[PDB]
Amino acid sequence: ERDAFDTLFDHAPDKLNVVKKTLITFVNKHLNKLNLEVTELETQFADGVYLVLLMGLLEGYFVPLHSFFLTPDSFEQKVLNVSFAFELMQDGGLEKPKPRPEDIVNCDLKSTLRVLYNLFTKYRNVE
């Protein structure tokens, strides 16, 4: 099974470009609160750190930095971080994400963008 996000990612370069553009703006609206900048969606979410921090910010709090692997030393620590971000998503009411947590760690762009897009849809009005 595929959906409209598969269709644009797979077939619509111009629409994909505004999606990416919008996602970079959105993730920085929040991550800039921590003096963090994203420039490259392809890799800067792979280690799970920004994704955890973003999830706290979208729900109005700062996640304790010792509660996840702030400087992950391995594939496994990255996967654990992504899994924790997915847990926070579900705790807040989102359906379990489509992608495996390791898909994000392995820098699958479509997986990364879908996850971020579903956050944007839900949380675009968080200040």
Residue numbers in the entry: 246 to 372
Paper passage:
The adaptor protein paxillin contains five conserved leucine-rich (LD) motifs that interact with a variety of focal adhesion proteins, such as α-parvin. It belongs to the highly conserved parvin family that shares a common architecture composed of a variable N-terminal region followed by two CH domains (Olski et al., 2001). Our results demonstrate that full-length α-parvin contains a single LD binding site, formed by the N-linker helix, helix A, and helix G of the C-terminal type-5 CH domain.
However, limited proteolysis led to the identification of a stable fragment, α-parvin-CHC, that readily crystallized. This fragment includes residues 242–372 and thereby spans the entire C-terminal CH domain as defined by SMART (Schultz et al., 1998) and a portion of the inter-CH domain linker. The crystal structure of α-parvin-CHC at 1.05 Å resolution was determined by molecular replacement using an ensemble of homologous type-1 CH domain structures as search model. In spite of very low levels of sequence conservation (≤26% identity) compared to canonical type-1 CH domains, α-parvin-CHC exhibits a typical CH domain core composed of four main α-helices (αA, αC, αE, and αG; nomenclature from Djinovic Carugo et al., 1997), which are connected by loops and shorter helical elements (αD and αF). Atypically, however, the N-terminal boundary of α-parvin-CHC is extended by a short α-helix comprising residues 249 to 256. This “N-linker helix” tightly associates with helices A and G of the canonical CH domain through electrostatic interactions (of residues D248, D251, and D255 with K355 and R359 in αG) and hydrophobic contacts (of residues F250, L253, and F254 with L354, K355, L358, and R359 of αG and K260 and L261 of αA). Interestingly, the crystal structure of α−parvin-CHC presented here shows that part of the putative ABS2 region is obstructed by the N-linker helix.
